[PDB]
Design a protein around this nucleic acid. Structure first.
Length: 195
RNA sequence: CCAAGAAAAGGACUGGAAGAAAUCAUCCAAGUUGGGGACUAUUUUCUGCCGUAUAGGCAG
């Protein structure tokens, strides 16, 4: 009904109401997968405790699935889709309606993590994590901008395309084609703002 | 409920004999195909011991 908080240590304890609503919606689909039992009070009541160690737990949830994915590998990683390892955790960032990083704190932590992941895995002769392919709609989300802007950014040569398409065809938004390390670096280099 | 209704064309057979297509001949003269250009990339093949040895055999 209102916020009214002070000494807001948890990442769920600050902000405008729309964000506070979005954070709960996200928590629910992701951890309350059990079918509705109209436990309208009890089901959501737990979300606050959950977030109290967030700055240090979210990363472990992401780390766990890097390893479980790795041991099930069937192709060299540089032809593997980003989605096969992280399971659309990126798309879920779109459920909070705000676009910028300083307000959408879920996206802010996911990017933090991916930047570190790339940093500890530099390029060498054998491919490794960080060379995964992103689709056009994924870069748009990580770069905090609409899709048409990515097409314009490609056209000017600020980033490379890795898969050669056939002639008399087009690459659709859903096709996986940019390397992760290329997107992370470009964003640090030329996409920052006061937000 | 048809110019309606029914229906065994069968049996036999020696085309033969003979022949010279031939003589002649000039396809020639001329002619500008040319101008430009990346097979390597997100490659997988490293590190050692024995053996005179770029031979031959081996662990990871």
């Amino acid at each position: 009904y209102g916020c009214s908080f002070e000494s807001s240590n948890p990442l769920l304890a600050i902000g405008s109401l729309s964000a506070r609503f979005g954070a709960l919606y996200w928590y629910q689909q992701r951890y309350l997968s059990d079918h509705e039992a109209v436990r309208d009070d009890r089901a959501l009541t737990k979300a606050i405790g959950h977030f109290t160690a967030w700055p240090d737990a979210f990363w472990r949830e992401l780390q766990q699935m890097v390893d479980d994915a790795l041991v099930r590998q069937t192709k060299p990683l540089n032809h593997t889709d980003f989605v096969d390892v992280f399971g659309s955790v990126v798309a879920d960032c779109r459920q909070i309606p705000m676009r910028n990083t300083g307000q959408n704190f879920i996206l802010k932590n996911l990017i933090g993590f991916l930047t570190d992941l790339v940093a500890r895995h530099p390029q060498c002769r054998v491919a490794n994590v960080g060379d995964l392919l992103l689709s056009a709609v994924d870069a748009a989300t990580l770069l905090s901008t609409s899709v048409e802007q990515v097409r314009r950014l490609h056209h000017e040569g600020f980033l490379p395309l890795s898969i050669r398409p056939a002639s008399r065809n087009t690459v659709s938004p859903h096709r996986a084609v940019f390397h992760l390390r290329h997107v992370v670096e470009l964003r640090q280099a030329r996409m920052q703002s006061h937000h």
